[PDB]
Amino acid sequence: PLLAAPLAVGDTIGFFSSSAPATVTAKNRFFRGVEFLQRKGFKLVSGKLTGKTDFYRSGTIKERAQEFNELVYNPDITCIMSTIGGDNSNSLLPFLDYDAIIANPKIIIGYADTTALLAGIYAKTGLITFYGPALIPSFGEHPPLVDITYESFIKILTRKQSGIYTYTLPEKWSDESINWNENKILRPKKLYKNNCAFYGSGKVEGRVIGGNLNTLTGIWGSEWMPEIRNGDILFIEDSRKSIATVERLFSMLKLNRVFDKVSAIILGKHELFDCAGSKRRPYEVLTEVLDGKQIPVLDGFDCSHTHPMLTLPLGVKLAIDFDNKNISITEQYLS
Amino acid sequence: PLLAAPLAVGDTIGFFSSSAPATVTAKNRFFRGVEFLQRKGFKLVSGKLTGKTDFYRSGTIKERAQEFNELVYNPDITCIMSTIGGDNSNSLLPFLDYDAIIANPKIIIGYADTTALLAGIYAKTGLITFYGPALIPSFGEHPPLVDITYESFIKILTRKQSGIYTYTLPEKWSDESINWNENKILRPKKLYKNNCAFYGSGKVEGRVIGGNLNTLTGIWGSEWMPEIRNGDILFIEDSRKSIATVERLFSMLKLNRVFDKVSAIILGKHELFDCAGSKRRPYEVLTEVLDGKQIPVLDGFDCSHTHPMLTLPLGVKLAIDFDNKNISITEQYLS
Numbered sequence: 144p145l146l147a148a149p150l151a152v153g154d155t156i157g158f159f160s161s162s163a164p165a166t167v168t169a170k171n172r173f174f175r176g177v178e179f180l181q182r183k184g185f186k187l188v189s190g191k192l193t194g195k196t197d198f199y200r201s202g203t204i205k206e207r208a209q210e211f212n213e214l215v216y217n218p219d220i221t222c223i224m225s226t227i228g229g230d231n232s233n234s235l236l237p238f239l240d241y242d243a244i245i246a247n248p249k250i251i252i253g254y255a256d257t258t259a260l261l262a263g264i265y266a267k268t269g270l271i272t273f274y275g276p277a278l279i280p281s282f283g284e285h286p287p288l289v290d291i292t293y294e295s296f297i298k299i300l301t302r303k304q305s306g307i308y309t310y311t312l313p314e315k316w317s318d319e320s321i322n323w324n325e326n327k328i329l330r331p332k333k334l335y336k337n338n339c340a341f342y343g344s345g346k347v348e349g350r351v352i353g354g355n356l357n358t359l360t361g362i363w364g365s366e367w368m369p370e371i372r373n374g375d376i377l378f379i380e381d382s383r384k385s386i387a388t389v390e391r392l393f394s395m396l397k398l399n400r401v402f403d404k405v406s407a408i409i410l411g412k413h414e415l416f417d418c419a420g421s422k423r424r425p426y427e428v429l430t431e432v433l434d435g436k437q438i439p440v441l442d443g444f445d446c447s448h449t450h451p452m453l454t455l456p457l458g459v460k461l462a463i464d465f466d467n468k469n470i471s472i473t474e475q476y477l478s
Numbered sequence: 479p480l481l482a483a484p485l486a487v488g489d490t491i492g493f494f495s496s497s498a499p500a501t502v503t504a505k506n507r508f509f510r511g512v513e514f515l516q517r518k519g520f521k522l523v524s525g526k527l528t529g530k531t532d533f534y535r536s537g538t539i540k541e542r543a544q545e546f547n548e549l550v551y552n553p554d555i556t557c558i559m560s561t562i563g564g565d566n567s568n569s570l571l572p573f574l575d576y577d578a579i580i581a582n583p584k585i586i587i588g589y590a591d592t593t594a595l596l597a598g599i600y601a602k603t604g605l606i607t608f609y610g611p612a613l614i615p616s617f618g619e620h621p622p623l624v625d626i627t628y629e630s631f632i633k634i635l636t637r638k639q640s641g642i643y644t645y646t647l648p649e650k651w652s653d654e655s656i657n658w659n660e661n662k663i664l665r666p667k668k669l670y671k672n673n674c675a676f677y678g679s680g681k682v683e684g685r686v687i688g689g690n691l692n693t694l695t696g697i698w699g700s701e702w703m704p705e706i707r708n709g710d711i712l713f714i715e716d717s718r719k720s721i722a723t724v725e726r727l728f729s730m731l732k733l734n735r736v737f738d739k740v741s742a743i744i745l746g747k748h749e750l751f752d753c754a755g756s757k758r759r760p761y762e763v764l765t766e767v768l769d770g771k772q773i774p775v776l777d778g779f780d781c782s783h784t785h786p787m788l789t790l791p792l793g794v795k796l797a798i799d800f801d802n803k804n805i806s807i808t809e810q811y812l813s
């Protein structure tokens with residue numbers, strides 16, 4: 144695979160808004176995120192659509208593609224980071240400068256709607272991109288949870304590329320829709336004990352592929368959707384969905400023969416899942432959809448819309464040990 | 479193509495609930511629909527999940543598939559009609575009896591989420607199915623709008639298969655979210671003049687394919703998504719979506735090279751479209767996504783979630799005359 148240069152303290156991070164104009168609509172949280180990374184020693188370059196609104200988006204399709212491309216053209220930038228997701232990153236894909244991405248590999252990081260770009264860029268270039276922090280939701284998060292997010296971010300991207308990396312398990316997590324865009328918290332978020340579950344036995348090692356499942360529907364079937372192959376580990380997460388939507392998305396994967404191919408599934412913790420009173424969790428729905436197909440599942444990986452968030456390279460080998468209840472990166476993912 | 483026998487007044491219509499359990503949650507409207515069709519002279523067979531609830535759905539995946547299949551097996555039923563949509567019809571697709579459908583073709587009709595079944599059945603069998611009335615939303619509608627819906631339903635399904643059929647244009651329409659499951663009305667729905675627009679010139683003739691666009695994402699990429707071919711007319715409609723979602727769905731089509739294949743696009747009227755304050759309509763968003771591609775568009779066809787609703791066969795040739803502002807079925811669609 145194509146590998147970007149590793150991150151280092153003091154590096155320059157460029158940020159872009161490929162969908163929702165949250166540098167305006169969540170400006171307080173944006174400013175907190177900016178200050179957080181600056182105090183860590185990072186220099187920041189603001190994408191050209193920062194501070195702009197086109198109602199539901201930051202700008203036209205072409206303007207958003209231009210914003211991203213301009214960061215790729217900047218030789219000082221080591222990391223290109225999403226400000227926030229939304230709905231509309233998939234629009235940009237025909238207009239990204241893939242040749243420039245190949246010529247100037249950088250750490251591309253974000254999540255949620257930005258999946259369209261992360262997966263699309265991988266499909267076109269083979270570049271290992273990252274499911275991880277977006278500036279506003281991730282680094283604008285109030286303490287204590289932001290520190291755990293940052294610890295993973297800095298560890299994954301700066302560590303020496305020798306031997307496997309085994310993920311730490313966040314001690315506590317939350318998904319509460321409070322403390323979004325103000326100077327002070329209303330009150331502390333509920334801190335849940337980590338209820339991540341490993342369904343299965345032994346160890347499964349394979350290339351990880353996926354991201355935000357709902358977002359994948361926007362690139363599905365196209366040349367920008369990476370081919371899922373036999374032995375892959377499927378990584379999927381969703382946010383604030385009804386159980387109805389979750390069944391729909393799981394069945395989509397089934398119809399596409401994904402469950403005939405994958406060796407394991409990682410479900411990211413689902414932010415504020417709406418069970419419609421059924422008290423069912425996504426894993427139970429997946430089990431029905433699977434129709435007896437035995438696939439080991441890591442249910443509740445902390446790489447999703449919940450806080451804190453871990454950083455995950457996409458398109459490289461992971462090993463999930465279902466007996467020892469851990470997950471590791473086993474393939475080099477930065478130069 | 480595989481063709482069902484035409485409907486006749488006095489025939490037996492079977493109904494099924496492949497997703498939302500609206501025979502329970504919208505019981506008043508359900509009874510209105512039942513009574514409406516019975517008064518027309520039709521006999522009705524209730525699917526086995528009528529009156530059942532599994533929270534967000536009518537029953538398990540397998541039970542919903544069985545409900546549908548049992549209607550196919552009933553020799554007295556000439557028309558199989560959806561009660562309502564939802565989210566979860568795509569789950570049924572591995573379990574439908576396609577061979578039984580081929581052996582005894584029937585009129586299969588519905589819309590919205592039921593698109594998964596209409597498209598899936600066509601993909602597997604070549605049966606010409608119908609984008610049209612579902613029992614609860616369509617026939618539980620109060621007069622006068624229900625009468626116009628019925629006129630199209632009965633005209634399309636009973637007419638002699640000789641010569642082209644040219645659609646009537648409903649004089650007035652509504653998408654107002656009132657008089658749903660209430661027993662007695664306070665006022666009729668606000669009525670709007672038909673603002674259907676023909677963007678383009680000349681005549682375009684091609685096989686119509688599509689349905690509810692959001693629903694198509696649940697079957698996309700699979701063997702149940704019918705292949706869109708050079709010359710097809712793409713028919714798409716959506717309901718109650720944000721402009722953000724509409725851009726995402728249009729761009730999905732673009733990424734899939736759909737706009738390189740289609741000879742025309744039919745946009746169904748979008749029920750309660752949320753423009754996010756932009757005052758933009760779906761056609762304007764489509765125009766941006768198309769990036770200069772000169773595809774003629776019929777914007778605002780009355781075959782969608784708005785009232786009244788026309789009945790449209792899927793998988794047969796239509797002719798859109800953009801100069802004379804009309805749309806016709808030009809290929810035999812019933813035996």
Ligand SMILES: NCCCO[P@](=O)(NC(=O)[C@@H](N)CC(=O)O)OC[C@H]1O[C@@H](n2cnc3c(N)ncnc32)[C@H](O)[C@@H]1O
Nearest residue numbers: 163227228229230255256280320321323357358382448
């Ligand atoms: N207009 C909203 C933009 C959504 O951007 P996104 O990156 N998500 C996506 O792209 C997928 N939904 C795409 C998909 O499902 O296909 O959200 C990131 C987090 O921000 C939080 N958040 C955003 N606004 C608020 C708010 N007003 N109050 C509290 N939390 C908020 C959310 O709770 C999320 O956890």
Ligand SMILES: NCCCO[P@](=O)(NC(=O)[C@@H](N)CC(=O)O)OC[C@H]1O[C@@H](n2cnc3c(N)ncnc32)[C@H](O)[C@@H]1O
Nearest residue numbers: 498562563564565590591615655658692693717749783
């Ligand atoms: N929970 C309701 C089930 C949705 O079933 P569906 O067949 N739609 C779909 O399958 C797509 N959304 C799938 C997709 O977009 O992917 O809706 C049909 C009409 O019923 C009306 N309706 C339903 N409930 C109400 C209500 N409480 N008040 C007023 N109108 C209502 C709606 O306004 C629609 O016009």
